[PDB]
């Protein structure tokens with residue numbers, strides 16, 4: 011088979027995942043397909059994860075049913091998986107007591123500088139010990155965390171694989187009564203949407219008892235340094251939850267109404283893309299343009315506000331750590347105390363450690379657990395019922411369609427000032443401290459020192475708020491202007507581009523690509539640039555204090571660029587192995603649920619269980635690699651993220667003779683903040699470059715074929731239907747640019763007011779004479795129509811004067827006044843006269859409005875007879891001279907067809923008609939007939955000679 015090295019691998023070799031290199035050495039050159047991924051451990055099969063839980067649940071049900079109570083399932087899980095989490099809790103108890111010891115040994119190094127005598131070696135080694143205790147917590151946090159994370163992630167897939175097994179095992183004991191009620195759709199939703207929530211629960215399960223413990227320890231440590239003034243920093247940290255939950259539940263409404271706005275646009279686009287051969291022939295391209303532009307305008311007007319909300323939320327998350335420190339320290343200073351450099355940065359670090367975890371992790375865990383319990387209750391209710399007896403162009407084209415480059419020069423200067431203020435606000439405190447220490451009572455004036463601080467604090471907020479809104483606007487205008495180009499381009503592409511491409515493709519494009527452009531890109535771009543600018547400030551602050559930390563940074567910045575590619579090469583292959591191996595599970599489940607009776611008839615109900623186990627083991631294999639390949643990278647990254655700190659600290663120590671406390675504390679407090687942002691910065695770029703493919707494929711349009719224009723300048727006479735004389739020549743056809751000809755040398759002669767009929771063999775080019783008059787596909791040759799050609803005149807000026815009668819009518823979503831006259835150019839009584847002349851006046855009398863009778867379901871409420879009648883009404887009201895009749899007889903014999911034929915024969919004042927048909931009897935009494943052979947034509951004078 012494929013023995014995996016996860017076993018037979020000593021310790022100190024699976025902490026760095028040293029056993030997973032050959033896979034990368036292989037995938038680097040060959041694109042492993044399916045047979046290069048290892049198997050699973052023995053204790054990860056389904057037969058081993060399904061039987062034990064089934065036994066526990068059966069024992070629970072028995073014990074319960076014994077005494078009068080209701081049985082539960084959340085007690086049969088915990089009875090099996092308690093030792094695992096009992097052991098996993100020790101670590102999270104050990105790593106939460108390390109984020110509290112760093113700031114306590116950071117405040118003891120700084121204290122060496124305030125009291126510094128160069129000729130004293132008994133107090134310099136103790137500082138080295140303090141700094142050494144500070145390099146053992148970073149290793150724990152950064153290196154030993156990625157194995158505990160893998161294990162707590164693997165502790166969920168076991169549950170998710172155990173549930174599905176018993177679920178399926180239950181789906182083969184159902185009785186007829188209980189089966190006919192529930193639909194298979196819900197049984198598959200159980201497995202496709204619910205169990206998939208057990209992979210995130212166990213991750214967010216320890217933030218419920220380790221969140222309320224960290225805050226107490228931190229607010230008890232703060233009291234020993236500064237005092238009561240700590241409370242003034244914990245009140246600006248509990249208000250954010252109220253002031254954000256309500257705003258989010260307000261935000262949801264905008265999204266709801268935006269969706270209910272945009273659904274109609276997609277519906278109308280679906281209705282347009284199908285039936286384009288009728289619109290392009292009736293010249294009705296503008297109405298849809300207008301009633302699409304309106305909806306798009308409304309959608310944009312409703313999206314702007316949501317975008318502003320999200321931008322303000324991001325800007326509030328950016329600069330919340332500056333409103334706490336300002337208040338607490340202005341209070342600590344106004345009460346009567348003095349300021350030093352050993353308390354400030356300790357408090358800074360503690361605040362930064364608390365606010366993040368509390369306000370970002372405590373809320374999500376509750377939602378996760380609630381969803382999990384809901385899913386568990388659903389599955390429980392199920393299990394108890396009865397049984398049986400790219401490139402840079404793709405960025406320019408997307409950024410230069412948003413605004414002039416002046417805006418791209420303004421937002422740069424707007425982004426490169428918020429960070430400057432973010433750093434100067436902190437530098438001011440070090441300046442204050444170093445000026446205080448030099449005293450011996452000539453105290454310090456508070457006005458200056460305390461006003462400059464408020465100024466630096468306000469500028470940050472203003473410059474952090476403006477940027478988000480500006481970026482959002484600049485990035486939404488781009489989509490706003492691309493969609494219009496796309497739409498206006500599709501209304502002119504010939505029909506050739508349509509019959510080869512399927513509707514689903516274009517519609518999925520218009521929906522999903524635009525959704526991505528309008529919803530997700532700006533947020534990711536903004537977060538990425540923000541988290542990328544924070545790091546540069548950290549580095550530039552650490553360098554300016556110790557210029558000798560620029561020599562190793564270059565060796566450390568060249569390994570990242572190669573490692574990223576060495577990983578991404580084979581990281582973009584496992585996703586395919588996951589998806590393609592996941593789909594067969596649902597496929598087999600659906601296939602097996604239907605064909606059930608044919609299974610119970612025979613005593614073979616376990617073979618399918620073996621097949622299901624086999625089909626799930628492959629997904630287990632392909633999922634066991636995702637976690638390991640995601641963890642093989644974070645360790646190497648955290649190695650650097652942690653070596654930086656060691657370098658900084660030991661440099662500060664071996665250079666204690668040429669600096670002071672303020673700047674070293676400033677450097678350390680910024681270096682101890684690098685373990686969270688680096689991962690996010692390196693992780694968002696992946697999503698960005700993944701979803702830019704929609705941008706790429708959208709610009710595939712905006713540059714396509716383009717037929718002749720709609721209107722020239724050589725206008726025709728005010729009325730040029732005078733004498734319909736459609737003469738012909740040796741013109742030919744070409745559907746494809748180099749395809750076969752379906753018509754050869756059709757030189758004929760049609761006279762004014764002469765009803766003509768065309769007969770032939772179905773498939774010999776009988777339905778191709780239509781594509782030359784309306785010139786859908788520009789043919790070769792000459793076609794004179796009343797002393798003038800059809801090639802030196804715009805399409806509209808021609809298509810508008812030749813009325814067609816299609817074979818299969820179609821109705822459009824709207825009133826009964828639009829389908830007959832979308833452009834108001836006639837009078838109501840005229841429409842009434844036409845309708846009553848087409849034998850339909852009482853049919854609309856029944857309905858309420860008589861001018862607002864909405865019809866839907868693609869004209870399903872009427873019969874083909876009424877549809878042909880209303881089309882004849884269109885033709886009548888149009889009142890043209892030429893008339894092109896087509897027919898496809900598949901209706902019934904009753905008075906419908908007889909009446910339409912009588913009307914065609916009597917109503918029209920013998921105005922240049924020419925008919926098509928297949929039934930020989932339909933074409934009778936005509937003047938001249940056309941027999942269409944397999945590519946030529948041999949007509950005769952009258953039907954009296956034909957037979």
Ligand SMILES: CCCCC[C@H](O)/C=C/[C@H]1[C@H](O)CC(=O)[C@@H]1C/C=C/CCCC(=O)O
Nearest residue numbers: 213366370371644685686687688689690693
């Ligand atoms: C500004 C945000 C700083 C904190 C983000 C933190 O570094 C999470 C990073 C992500 C990144 O994909 C790599 C990694 O290990 C984390 C993946 C897990 C995310 C969900 C649980 C995060 C969780 O434990 O809560």
